[PDB]
């Protein structure tokens, strides 16, 4: 900081560096909150249990990243515990890691999916890519079908959506004549 | 002009399949960390319930865009330990087990040619912040990048399953259960598909194999030479990052307020007068977020179109043989091989291209003794003295015979018919 | 869109009547202008989102029309374009705001192993099948169509000859019936 400078500003124009007037040192200000908290839940009418995925943080340092000291005791249970689990995306709290693999029920990310399973709780597992099936192969062996099935599949395709019309006047200006008069100059917008 | 030779051309085409999933926090973007501003943002909450919906609609879509492109078959096949494919070499495209992942050589080259400058562990930003990392500013302004559902190793596993099924069973695994077939016989099926008799393949199999191998080599050094080829994917990355950067830069606008800094307003003015200025800033930043979400929806629609095209190509060229012209490479399609790439797929379309044409004299039919003879399949070709029946796509002449041709009426109405005898066994 | 009418947009109130009853036209006009600007912005956002969804629906309807042309009105050779398996027919069924295609397809069911060879060396000349492949049950060879096991004796009409039988890799020895 040059002697004529006291405040530093980033590209967003919000002040980020400040020279402390008493002790002539530069201090950086960072947000005390952050984005990246995701809440994983089975649909209510099933259970109120939930898991919390904190993005791009080791669960060792989640308490300082989230500032769990200033949070309510109900939040602190999701800050640390025995259900800590690490993923490439981030780290997950409130879900029991399972080595077994199933289909994806509630996708978390980075190949991790969560589900509500059995004592009912929420498990988090690496999703499977379907059945593993090695196929035999030889330079002088073929497989010929001797029978068939006539299978009828179904597929649905949207064709149209609801045709809709908007009246600017009665939307913007319910019944007042003053507002309707003031809306004339914006007619070029509404006709658009 | 009938070809007398051929070339096995391998063409590489890249298709973006997905884009970076993103999420936005209204509260910490607009009203950074001040309670006074966030209270004023409650009345606009509905707008964010729109925005957070739209971005969510994009994010899930991107996962789906990957799935329908790569999850064609749920039977994860494994290539056999023995590589005996009639001289065909698939080392550069099949998985390499000497790596932590299962990426092939070509997949590794594709991955190394795209930067994808995006995971920054939250906590590194709280440290060396003087470097002014873009991702740190985005994260402090509430612009988080969610990760893709399918890991890169998992997409590589899907691609490996597709390759194994294609080489070990042809198209039979697309239409249900995989069925064995020697690779030479599979290539014979493909050659019959493009209208050239299979007997040529076994007569030139080694040559064909060599050509194929050479073509694969021409891909490798081509992908290891320059990164311009993947410009489709890199742009799809860069543009997204660009948008996010713009968003952060757009926080530096007054929008008619006295200043662009919320704390500056709240420090000069009081709640008496700061409310109108904060409302102006809130409206402007909400409009900026709406613009970002709309542009993201446009790009998501474009990526959905690209991914639907990629899925169609996966179904119609990797899982089968496409008779559509130019749909899968220039030439007559024979096979396709998928290769995962960052936020996209790469198709190696192998095609039959006739090489050495030669002038020939032809007639539409042959009048034997009054009746006109038309070829069952092929054309009548004369080298100057005699006549032969030749298949369209290859020069394999054979003497005219009653089984090569069929008769239809007398030989007076056909224009261009000529005189010659036809052998009768 | 209806819910977004409860936003001040910087005005003193979100209701026109409150503004017009508290303020005369002197100062009410600026407030009503702010409300008009905000509500017009909301309408523009709605129309833009509707255009995006219309583009989605138009793509889906183009796909539906292509499927109706290529599968209901014909037989599609494109793989997996109309159902899994080999396409036989398709039946349309109207649904609210959409179409439902019933794709009837042929799926091979029971597969059997068979030892195969690319060609057959009869008496020096190699024989290749016209439509089918050579399959052996252990002792004899038969020409069978590819999608169904319908073996039949090797015959000069079933196959065709091209050149000597030394160049083909994997050729096997057998006789061919000459009627
Ligand atoms: C081919 O598959 C069909 C069924 O998909 C077989 O038909 C069944 O045969 C058993 C025993 O005769 C009956 O109990 C079933 O009622 C039949 N099902 C139907 C729908 O008809 C048929 O036998 C198989 N053919 C061959 C040669 O394997
Ligand atoms: C068809 O084209 C290929 C091109 O490769 C020819 O193969 C080449 O022939 C020359 C001369 O014998 C050799 O020097 C090359 O080494 C061959 N290249 C490969 C990859 O094998 C082939 O001879 C041509 N066949 C006909 C009938 O014209
Ligand atoms: C298939 O192509 C490769 C050329 O890339 C052949 O040679 C191998 O290439 C890799 C490149 O990393 C080397 O690591 C190997 O040592 C090479 N092996 C040999 C025997 O040369 C490879 O041989 C070909 N596949 C077969 C079965 O021959
Ligand atoms: C092909 O063969 C037929 C008969 O073998 C030829 O027909 C003759 O043509 C000459 C000249 O026009 C006539 O004088 C004869 O009367 C025809 N005879 C018969 C039986 O048709 C025919 O000309 C030959 N084609 C050409 C180009 O010469
Ligand atoms: C297929 O038929 C040919 C012609 O009869 C066989 O050719 C010879 O067979 C004798 C014994 O039967 C061998 O001593 C010769 O070496 C064969 N000729 C050559 C050039 O090798 C041929 O052996 C038969 N194919 C097989 C695999 O036995
Ligand atoms: C007072 O200001 C001076 C200069 O900034 C600083 O050195 C000192 O620590 C401050 N506090 C006291 C008690 O002097
Ligand atoms: C967080 O976890 C990753 C796992 O690789 C490790 O590399 C890193 O050192 C850890 N950081 C901290 C502060 O624990
Ligand atoms: C699951 O995998 C981990 C690998 O570290 C292992 O430590 C653990 O014992 C396994 N648990 C079960 C129930 O298999
Ligand atoms: C075929 O004949 C035409 C006319 O003489 C000539 O222009 C052309 O170059 C020839 N093409 C070949 C392959 O000989
Ligand atoms: C045309 O083909 C026949 C049979 O192979 C041959 O006898 C004749 O010499 C060839 N004539 C020319 C000009 O190539
Ligand atoms: C082909 O073109 C030439 C020149 O116009 C003509 O002499 C000849 O009659 C034509 N062939 C036939 C069957 O008419
Ligand atoms: C065909 O042969 C392979 C290897 O011998 C075997 O794995 C496979 O099960 C056989 N097919 C059937 C239907 O048994
Ligand atoms: C193979 O088919 C022939 C047909 O005549 C039959 O005679 C023979 O018993 C069959 N052998 C086996 C192992 O199925
Ligand atoms: C086919 O495979 C077997 C063993 O894998 C081998 O002995 C034989 O030589 C091969 N034949 C051909 C034509 O590749």
Numbering used by the authors:
A (entry chain C): 559 to 676, 689 to 762
B (entry chain B): 713 to 830, 834 to 1140
C (entry chain C): 962 to 1140
Question: Could you pull the original sentences from the published paper?
Answer:
Consistent with the predicted effect of the engineered disulfide bond, 3D classification of S-R/x3 particles showed that the majority of the particles (76%) are in the locked conformation, while 23% of the particles are in the closed conformation. Further 3D classification after symmetry expansion revealed that locked S-R/x3 spike protomers adopt two distinct conformations that differ primarily at domain D, we will refer to these conformations as “locked-1” and “locked-2”. Classification revealed that locked S-R/x3 S trimers were formed by all four possible combinations of locked-1 and locked-2 protomers (the combinations 111, 112, 122 and 222). In the locked-1 conformation, residues 617–641 in domain D form a large loop, of which residues 632–641 can be clearly identified in the cryo-EM density while residues 619–631 are disordered and not resolved. In the locked-2 conformation, residues 617–641 in the locked-2 protomer are ordered and can be clearly identifiable in cryo-EM density. We observed density consistent with the presence of the pigment biliverdin in the reported NTD binding pocket in all our spike structures, consistent with the greenish color of the purified protein.
